[PDB]
């Protein structure tokens, strides 16, 4: 039988209730929080399943959770219900005080679930003002169970309030156990880059091979099925956060939402983005490899490194994210104003069970304050740079992209969890 970490459940559900009751921003008018997971074949990033992973240690498909002021209802298959009895039966657990008692309902396979749906709907109507439900608006899972539930729920005319941003902030600070998972993810990412990827690229360059970016990305995906790069980790606990992104030869997009294209790799500036997800917890790395970079290319690259460390020095508990952003852009404006229009609009983002927290992005508008124990992907780049010495079109335009997994510390500059050496000595390839 799979053990549920009960103490972690009670700590975290208490954090959720504390913030909900505090009633700031999107929490203010919410009468009940309603979270439902359908079929998930692709294991997509979603607040609904991230919340499950946070509370229970595991995603639970075809499962509904209703958080009310004085009760909590979980509805799932008999086997998942049996699993949840570990926290539903409290057995005098001291930690159980900060949240309501749990009622478990069984999802029937061969029978109508109307009776259970009605119980949850009545619980919502009875919770606080019984009018508005907190939801994750982006999440729509397929399958018959979600169809049936949504049909039932939609008849009731509850107002839906998106709570994605406030929940992101609620779960952002990592417990030590979670940080250990993210540290392991970061170390696996670093080992795959150091031992496999960088070597592979140097082989390709030394042999003057023509390799499509897409094919190189596939090779990296295959590499993490090999135990030699996992340092003891069960291979089934390791996944890519996203398909590895390799770009070169004047075609760059510096973001994590695009895949590697089919062009042959140019021995240029080669941007390489990859991250490992270990036991559902994400990490991220970006390195640019440079073949015979000129003095001017090196100058821009070293300035990029300078900006990153300036960012880490500013990313400290209590500081507003936008103020970190402005501090870094101030350095660009002062020292290299010509790069103001070349630099990435975002400098990084909060990272966790979900890879990229859209409300935690480091940009000019973000008002959220940093807290000790939050983890970020800190990413900075320059795009659309011109190489003067370039002749062919693939040589003329280059980009520079750097990123690391970092931890907001107790005091002082943020701590870097990834370990891949980034000096020109390390990422330069000289023919």
Residue numbers in the entry: 2 to 432
Which lines from the publication concern this structure?
The histone chaperone FACT plays an important role in facilitating nucleosome assembly and disassembly during transcription. FACT is a heterodimeric complex consisting of Spt16 and SSRP1. Spt16 consists of an NTD followed by an SSRP1 dimerization domain, MD and C-terminal domain. The N-terminal domain of Spt16 resembles an inactive aminopeptidase.
Here, the crystal structure of the N-terminal domain (NTD) of human Spt16 is reported at a resolution of 1.84 Å. Our human Spt16 NTD construct consists of residues 1–510. While the construct contains residues 1–510, electron density for residues 433–510 was not visible. The structure of human Spt16 NTD reveals two lobes: an N-lobe comprising residues 1–175 and a C-lobe comprising residues 176–432. The structure adopts an aminopeptidase-like fold similar to those of the Saccharomyces cerevisiae and Schizosaccharomyces pombe Spt16 NTDs. Despite the presence of a linker between the two lobes, the orientation of the two lobes appears to be rigid across the three Spt16 NTD structures. Isothermal titration calorimetry analyses show that human Spt16 NTD binds histones H3/H4 with low-micromolar affinity, suggesting that Spt16 NTD may contribute to histone binding in the FACT complex. An ITC experiment with human Spt16 NTD against H2A/H2B showed very little change in enthalpy when Spt16 NTD was added to H2A/H2B, suggesting that Spt16 NTD does not bind H2A/H2B or binds with a very weak affinity. Surface-residue conservation and electrostatic analysis reveal a conserved acidic patch that may be involved in histone binding.
